[PDB]
Structure 1
Amino acid sequence: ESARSLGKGSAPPGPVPEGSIRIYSMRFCPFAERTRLVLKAKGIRHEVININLKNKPEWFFKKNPFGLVPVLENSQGQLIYESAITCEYLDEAYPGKKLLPDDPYEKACQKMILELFSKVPSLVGSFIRKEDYAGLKEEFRKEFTKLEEVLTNKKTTFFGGNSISMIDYLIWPWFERLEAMKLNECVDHTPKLKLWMAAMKEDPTVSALLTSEKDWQGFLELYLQNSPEACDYGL
């Protein structure tokens, strides 16, 4: 199967065909879902090759010395890693609707909001891995209020305005999994952030890439056990 992840013993991929771009991804990784949301929203011709993050092949470290996902690779052999960098690269290098505003200040704002979100993925990961949960859930609420304050001052539904933009796709994957883990109580003190979650689920690009709550919980149970079959959950 083409979606099955590549582990140790897999052959490194061949050259990227011209006119297309390759993304080294993982179907349950929020950092890579950022890039795939942009690829879907911009209708970019691309191919997906999943990396078994619990059985990483050694050749993948040549694509990215951090050994991390997502990674983009065009026909010229050029490689782009870091999730936010891959998204901005796709928004610039490809035609269609711009997910990033053309105004220098409004684009600086989305990057500033991204920085307000920077602490969440780390706290989110430590909470998944002793019952100190109460402290990590409180550290969630503290970071979530910072997002709530942005929506309060902007007086809009999305973080970039009344329409969905790049910053929404950068933030959404961690709140998509929040509902799948029955952790919606962590945003009952952030009503505008909670409304934003509901508005994101109405987006065609978002709902096309949504992972069911049973698929995420099944993957996460295998991933926390470091199972080599975690990244291929659901075939």
Structure 2
Amino acid sequence: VEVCVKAAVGAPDILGDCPFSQRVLLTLEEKKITYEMKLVDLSNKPEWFLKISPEGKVPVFNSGDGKWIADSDVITQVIEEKFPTPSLVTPPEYASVGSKIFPSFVKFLKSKDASDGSEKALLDELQALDEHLKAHGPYISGENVSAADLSLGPKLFHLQVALEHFKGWKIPENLTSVHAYTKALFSRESFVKTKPANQYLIAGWAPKVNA
């Protein structure tokens, strides 16, 4: 088992901040699968990587056969089929939970005009996630962590770190179910082992925020 993930911006021999690559890693960590992690510097991609990912995209996964798979959605489904135990299956009904939070965070983060509706749109998506988590918590599905949490968790981590750093913005205390969820998700062994260091997540966003 092998996976190519994004290396840290300015530190090519260190794990980077790709939220989709972290979703793959969280899945491998929760399922206790032995895997080789291959770090890819996206600013200076090597030859071995360009051969297996010609579009130059990460994550890219290998199950055992030399067949490299792209798209973290296909990758996590491939892992679930080949390694069904322990279960990470999220019921299809809760698949879309918190999906609009990440692009709304990115839109608000990149915003330089406070008079636009980017702060409100993001608050609405977070209010809707708190509603789901109050009715179906602590996680997206039951009391147990599932696939959808490993997709959303990293996206929420970027939201937390980047919005605190660049705008001094935090998720309101009003959303208790969201806070309980991030506190539980981020403190999990798998998350502690695969999260980028604050420094590297900021170095990842900095040129995008300033552009």
Category of TM-score, reference length = shorter chain:
0.7 to 0.9
Structure 1 partner of 2:80: 91
Matched, 1:23 2:35: no
Aligned to 1:164: 145
Distance 1:224 1:52 in 2: 20
The aligned counterpart of 1:120 is: 101
Name the counterpart of 1:233.
none
Q: Does 1:47 align with 2:28?
A: no
Cα distance in 2 for partners of 1:34, 1:167 equals 9
Is 1:143 matched with 2:109? no
Asked if the contact 2:102/2:159 (under 8 Å) is kept, the reply is no
CA RMSD of aligned residues (A): 2.8
How far did residue 65 of structure 1 move?
Answer: 5.9
* Residues 50 and 136 of structure 1: CA distance in aligned 2, closer, same or farther (over 3 Å): farther
Is the 1:23–1:46 Cα contact (8 Å) retained in structure 2? yes
State the distance in 2 between where 1:213 and 1:224 align.
16
Amino acid at match of 1:157: P
Q: Which moved more, 1:121-130 or 1:189-198?
A: 121-130
Q: Give distance in 2, aligned partners of 1:215 and 1:174.
A: 15
What is the alpha-carbon distance in structure 1 between the residues aligned to residue 54 and residue 118 of structure 2? Answer: 30
Q: Aligned partners of 1:201, 1:130: CA distance in 2, in Å?
A: 27
- Structure 2: which 5+ runs fail to align? 7-15
Q: 1:87 to 1:128 in 2, by over 3 A?
A: same
The aligned runs of 1:99-118 (5 Å cut-off) are 99-100=88-89, 107-113=91-97, 116-117=98-99
Conserved 8 A contact 1:24-1:71: yes
Residue from 176, 179, 197 that aligns with 1:212:
197
TM-score normalized with structure 1 length: 0.71
Measured after TM superposition, the shift of residue 72 of structure 1 is 0.7
- Identify the residue that residue 9 of structure 1 maps to in structure 2: none
SS in structure 2 at match of 1:186:
coil
Q: Which runs of 5+ in 1 are unaligned?
A: 1-20, 102-106, 227-235
SS at match of 1:185: coil
Which structure's relative contact order is higher, taking Cα pairs within 8 Å and 6+ residues apart? 2
Contact 1:25 1:70 in 2 (8 A): yes
Residues 218 and 151 of structure 1: is their aligned pair in 2 closer, same or farther, counting only changes over 3 Å? same
CA offsets 1:119-162 (integer angstroms, 9 cap, x no match): 333333344445135632322112212212211222x2111111
Q: Percent identity?
A: 21
> Partners in 2 of 1:179 and 1:130 — Cα distance?
16
2:135 aligns with one of 153, 158, 168: 153
Distance 1:198 1:184, change over 3 A: farther
Amino acid at match of 1:217: I
Structure 1 counterpart of 2:23, from 34, 37, 44: 34
